[PDB]
Amino acid sequence: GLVPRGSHMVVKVGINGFGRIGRLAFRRIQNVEGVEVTRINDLTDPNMLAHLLKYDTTQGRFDGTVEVKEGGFEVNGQFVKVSAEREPANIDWATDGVEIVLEATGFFASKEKAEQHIHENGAKKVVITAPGGNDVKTVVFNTNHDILDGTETVISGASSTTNCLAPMAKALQDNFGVKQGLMTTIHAYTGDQMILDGPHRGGDLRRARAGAANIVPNSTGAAAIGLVIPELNGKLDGAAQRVPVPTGSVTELVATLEKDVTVEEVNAAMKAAANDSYGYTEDPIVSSDIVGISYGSLFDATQTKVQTVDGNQLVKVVSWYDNEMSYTSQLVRTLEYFAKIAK
Amino acid sequence: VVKVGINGFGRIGRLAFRRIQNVEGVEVTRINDLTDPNMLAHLLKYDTTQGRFDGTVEVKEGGFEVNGQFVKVSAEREPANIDWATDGVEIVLEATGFFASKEKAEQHIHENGAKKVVITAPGGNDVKTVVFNTNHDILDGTETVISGASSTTNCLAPMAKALQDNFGVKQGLMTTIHAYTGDQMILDGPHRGGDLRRARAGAANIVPNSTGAAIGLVIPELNGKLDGAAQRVPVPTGSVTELVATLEKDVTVEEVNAAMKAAANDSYGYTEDPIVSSDIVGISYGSLFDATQTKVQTVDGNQLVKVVSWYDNEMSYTSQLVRTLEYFAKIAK
Amino acid sequence: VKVGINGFGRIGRLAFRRIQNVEGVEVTRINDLTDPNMLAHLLKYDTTQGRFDGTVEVKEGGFEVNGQFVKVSAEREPANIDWATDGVEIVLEATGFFASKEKAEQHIHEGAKKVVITAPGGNDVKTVVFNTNHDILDGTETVISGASSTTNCLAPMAKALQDNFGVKQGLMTTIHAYTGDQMILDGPHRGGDLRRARAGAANIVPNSTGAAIGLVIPELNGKLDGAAQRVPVPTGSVTELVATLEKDVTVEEVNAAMKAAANDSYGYTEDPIVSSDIVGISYGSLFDATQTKVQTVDGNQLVKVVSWYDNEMSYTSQLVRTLEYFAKIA
Amino acid sequence: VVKVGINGFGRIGRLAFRRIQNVEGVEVTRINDLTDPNMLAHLLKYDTTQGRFDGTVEVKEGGFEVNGQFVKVSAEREPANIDWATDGVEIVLEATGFFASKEKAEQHIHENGAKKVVITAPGGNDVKTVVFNTNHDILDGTETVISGASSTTNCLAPMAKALQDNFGVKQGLMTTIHAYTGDQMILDGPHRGGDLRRARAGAANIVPNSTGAAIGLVIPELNGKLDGAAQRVPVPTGSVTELVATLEKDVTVEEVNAAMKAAANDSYGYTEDPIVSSDIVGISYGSLFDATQTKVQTVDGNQLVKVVSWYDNEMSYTSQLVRTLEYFAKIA
Ligand SMILES: NC(=O)c1ccc[n+]([C@@H]2O[C@H](COP(=O)([O-])OP(=O)(O)OC[C@H]3O[C@@H](n4cnc5c(N)ncnc54)[C@H](O)[C@@H]3O)[C@@H](O)[C@H]2O)c1
Ligand SMILES: NC(=O)c1ccc[n+]([C@@H]2O[C@H](COP(=O)([O-])OP(=O)(O)OC[C@H]3O[C@@H](n4cnc5c(N)ncnc54)[C@H](O)[C@@H]3O)[C@@H](O)[C@H]2O)c1
Ligand SMILES: NC(=O)c1ccc[n+]([C@@H]2O[C@H](COP(=O)([O-])OP(=O)(O)OC[C@H]3O[C@@H](n4cnc5c(N)ncnc54)[C@H](O)[C@@H]3O)[C@@H](O)[C@H]2O)c1
Ligand SMILES: NC(=O)c1ccc[n+]([C@@H]2O[C@H](COP(=O)([O-])OP(=O)(O)OC[C@H]3O[C@@H](n4cnc5c(N)ncnc54)[C@H](O)[C@@H]3O)[C@@H](O)[C@H]2O)c1
Ligand SMILES: O=C[C@H](O)COP(=O)(O)O
Ligand SMILES: O=C[C@H](O)COP(=O)(O)O
Ligand SMILES: O=C[C@H](O)COP(=O)(O)O
Ligand SMILES: O=C[C@H](O)COP(=O)(O)O
């Protein structure tokens, strides 16, 4: 009973933080009818942002025309306003008809701080492009977007590893039942790592190190999975290994299950679970092959292991994801759906 | 002074040569590869990941001089045709990567050739496989062909044995996040070994792959209880092994770390510093346990235990290789 | 016209890709040193150039591309390749091992009619950079060269200077992506080069360059020389040229001359781009006006001009353009 | 024993600190940055490109100990508010990259502050700019603010002076193929300095850029005769400078190389080995001439001359910086 809007009824979106996720979100929204970006807020001039939209190291040239103007830029003829406001409270989103804001700066990833966007002359709702705490509904599309009714003011689109892990873990649960599991993500380097050894503003002694020249251990925002799959809460934990590729990642999960299984049964379950969000492949691919994909998670049957020792089984399952575009695809899918049921 | 020969003056061969400079009673008198001495002399002097050679290297005819001492160089394809005895060589380091079996490594042993061979890699189940300070007991000195194992094996072995001896291991799964190597392609192209993943550009990709860690040969009681795989990533050297395992006893994170510290020696290191891969380049430990990455997950009375150890696939292995070579040379009967 | 590819490597595979969108050119036979499954996989998936735009399915003795079967063979000697069996008239020699008239001719026997070498092929072989000197071709030739990637970059930029201002002399530096003939890690280089021996994705590596040109622009013969700096990117390059000219010039005049010279082969841009922005482009050379310098000291001028190129796809685009044109003149 | 302070414990600051351990007249008693001592202690111990610290480092309150000796750490944003005198500091190494001018570097000199300042970068035309063993003659010891030049300047200077003194230089154009640096972005993003190229992912691109060596302050006679640019490329340190020039005299390749060998010293190295960038990481030469890359093109009586020298933008510069600091400290 959610009375969703048609794609002909156009919801106007604002992007706070025109960074990797923000710019890629903007790109995908070009091919979503009924969602449209009318306002961008960052910490720089429009020429910088226009240039970064046109040209993209890992994701290729922009599919269209971009021309700089005063106080903004034009994309395929359509003007988009640019502002440079530090404080989310001072952003006059309503001036440009913006109802929903994509919070993509990485600095306001909580209910309290994201709410600052909602005020007079501001926005109605906010989607955080990251984990946003336990008091915020956290959505991985085609896994738990049921939870949305449309009344919510602040929601989270989860992390990129969460979007990778979730469908793979849920497939295990639903078919076999999961007792417990440990996860390792072999992950591309990101903007919060230092280009060369130097003082990390977050106090992390490992993110302080040269990210494109090191294997760097680190924490992960997907262990936060109980918010997406309630029945698995407290049963999964894990960590990351940040490695020298500018984008593209893979999640390994080692787990104990309720029932006995074979490699063939596991792969078959994953193929059966496949959809627009959760992909399936039996090709021996590498990280560059998943750059720019629209799947939130791509299961790799070639890496599946089922070890049996004295009646006991450890099960290993592995799924690829482009931490940039895979997440962004899921983010926009969640945004689109949320916009149509917004109250 | 036992005189050694190196077949395959590659990454492991050149680094083995370097370490042997500081081992009294071991000395390299003959090198065999597929190239001229100028190429090899240059590759010894200058090293991308391991730094400049600590000494003098000057090219001569049919060889080169290292700190005054001449070392002969030959370019023989077939191990059968290498006249090792001419230069007083008794033991050969087989480091080409093309003769890693008993049958093929034996070809070094003939008249005018060598007496013994150490393979710098896994060499099959009919060859004693040694990780130093873990199972070098098995050597009596009568053996003709031995294996020094793989680099991941030298990393995993002491960490796994420490778990076994203290707590007892039921089963375990391993992932090594591993530097790229010479058998990967620099850019996408046909791999001569038929591997569709090693075919891909190794310095521009996360590349899944099999792993040579053959652990039951080193720790017999764990045979068939451990399996694993690799993720090859863009660093020119330096690696880390993660092991997830179930144990016979209940444990805490503190107990696990304490067991590892107690097990520490020249081969097995210990650290509580939050280090990264570049910090282990050139170390002499075969394995360096990292207490900062230890996990002990407890869910409904059941425990999964995660333990992680660093290793420089190049120098860590080479240090272990030379330690094993030194010891084997002294008991050679 | 039915084409054969010898050496299904970086250039061979990318040539194959471009030929899909050239009507009247079609690849019916591939020869390499491996099984079809390896080659089919390498066609589908490409680190730097992206996934294949189509379907690839492995068969016996070959593979299918969008339904069409393409035969695969594994013959080491070009003399033993029975090209005629598959109606092949022209062969793309892309192995890097037969880059001379003598050795490339070995394809022509009872086999193929003609051969295009995907590299410099000596002074006794017509060397073509498309839209610069493809006028040279009459169609009777048995063996031709498509030049090198740096040659295709430099040529239109250097000719534009000559035609407008006249060139006295010049020195060139290409800051170049690493290539397959470099070692992944320090090791013995089969060609004897002590620098290509070194880890190519972890070093700035000085090296020689195959663009030292008089074969493409006769009037500039012996007036240009240069070198390379190989650097850690898997593809994408840039050529810098410092030169003395016959006439006095300004920065504006130079850029204007380059824009006037622009076409399908020679691009023009005033955007401050980087190497990743030129990966996969179809221009053989893309002049960058932002890097132009004209230094004047005591009446004398040094002139600096810079052009981008994807050593892989830029060259391949030029190669296929030259192949298409050469095929049509029987 | 002259007591030194480091403002900005970054790449140059930390490496300067390392080299000062083996300089007897010089000692670091105070470090100022924007972080806690644990972060700085860790970054001193472990170094991606330059290797582990040769010694012992242990964290304390308000500082850390190095081989037993305590060094104080503070976190003051404004150079005016740094009480250098408290720790006996006379000379400050300004290594933040944010105070590279006479005006802004002078802010270190006040009551309870420092006496003198060495900027680890170009610092404008009103500040004596020194490349050691090329023009450190210029120093008399009365100066309040000096510059140690840039890394490319320290590379280029001895190579260019050798050309001038032997053959005479008419004009020249320079290209440095340079390692990426901290002021580039790790991934595509808004550059705080407004540069659209430094905005791009530095470890995944060839990135054109300006250069801080484009030299008349170091070699007066060459002023306005040289200009150039950079190509930033994916290595975490290590660089090479190419110079193409016209000369007053005719020359051969052998004569050029011979002139460079004759000019060699502790600052200016010479080599005939075909080396690559990793081979110069951590060297103490400010500039290392490579004879293998020399070219002398002759066309119709006219000559273009190409000369190339290696440098570790990090340690080569730092070696020169400390040599200049040592000498400057001695003549106060
Ligand atoms: N990159 C990924 O792989 C990835 C994946 C999933 C989620 N995320 C999340 O998305 C968010 C951003 O990630 P990213 O990698 O795109 O970040 P980024 O660093 O690339 O971009 C952040 C942008 O925010 C801007 N910004 C910073 N402070 C601001 C302020 N006060 N006001 C306005 N703008 C400001 C910056 O100028 C920059 O343009 C984070 O929450 C991150 O956790 C990132
Ligand atoms: N590099 C590592 O991380 C590592 C660690 C442990 C073990 N290993 C093992 O050590 C061996 C060598 O590895 P690498 O990376 O040092 O090899 P590499 O590719 O660097 O060197 C192989 C060398 O052997 C030479 N060679 C090849 N065929 C030959 C022949 N028929 N006769 C004489 N010389 C020949 C080559 O010229 C080359 O110098 C392999 O078995 C490998 O599995 C490697
Ligand atoms: N990639 C570039 O940057 C570039 C640009 C312009 C020109 N070229 C030239 O193109 C040629 C190929 O370069 P590449 O980069 O594609 O190299 P590559 O190494 O990727 O391709 C060579 C291919 O030929 C095959 N091959 C080798 N020997 C053979 C034989 N005897 N018979 C049949 N097949 C054989 C190999 O298996 C490999 O797949 C070279 O001449 C090179 O100089 C390269
Ligand atoms: N790295 C090189 O290649 C190189 C070579 C020659 C010269 N330089 C010069 O050295 C200077 C610094 O270079 P870098 O690459 O080491 O920088 P960096 O980014 O490594 O270090 C800068 C340090 O200064 C600190 N800092 C910033 N603002 C500060 C303030 N207000 N007060 C105290 N500390 C502050 C930072 O936290 C950081 O630790 C620049 O002027 C640069 O031109 C660098
Ligand atoms: O920082 C951004 C990451 O891409 C998302 O976090 P994660 O790797 O833990 O999922
Ligand atoms: O060839 C590579 C080294 O021997 C180590 O590889 P590994 O993971 O099989 O031990
Ligand atoms: O063109 C072939 C290789 O890419 C090398 O290029 P180059 O000879 O133009 O320098
Ligand atoms: O940004 C820091 C540079 O290293 C400064 O030195 P440079 O101008 O000589 O390149």
Author numbering:
A (entry chain D): -7 to 215, 217 to 336
B (entry chain C): 2 to 214, 217 to 336
C (entry chain A): 3 to 112, 114 to 215, 218 to 335
D (entry chain B): 2 to 215, 218 to 335
Text lifted from the article:
GAPDH plays a key role in glycolysis and gluconeogenesis by catalyzing the reversible oxidative phosphorylation of D-glyceraldehyde 3-phosphate (D-G3H) to the energy-rich intermediate glyceraldehyde 1,3-bisphosphate (1,3-BPG). Recent studies suggest that GBS GAPDH is a major virulence factor and a potential vaccine candidate. GBS GAPDH exists as a tetramer. Each GAPDH subunit is composed of two domains, and consists of 13 helices and 2 β-sheets of 9 and 8 strands.
We prepared the ternary complex of GBS GAPDH by co-crystallization of an active site mutant C152S enzyme with NAD+ and the substrate D-G3H. In the present complex, the C3-phosphate of the substrate binds at the ‘new Pi’ site in all four subunits. The phosphate group of the substrate forms hydrogen bonds with Ser151 OG, Thr153 OG, Gly213 (backbone N atom) and Thr212 OG. There is some difference in the orientation of the glyceraldehyde moiety in different subunits. In subunits B and D, a rotation around the C3-O1P bond allows the formation of a hydrogen bond between Ser152 OG and the hydroxyl oxygen O2 of the substrate. Substrate binding to the holo enzyme induces much smaller changes. The main difference is the movement of loop 211–215 that moves towards the phosphate group of the substrate in the ‘new Pi’ site. One difference between holo-enzyme and ternary complex are the observed interactions of Arg235. In the ternary complex the residue moves closer to the ‘new Pi’ site where the substrate phosphate group is bound (4.6 Å distance), which leads to disruption of the salt bridge with Asp184 while hydrogen bonds with side chains of Thr182 and Gln185 remain. Modeling of a cysteine residue in place of Ser152 in the structure of the ternary complex shows that the SG atom remains at a similar distance (3.6 Å) from His179 NE2 in all four subunits.
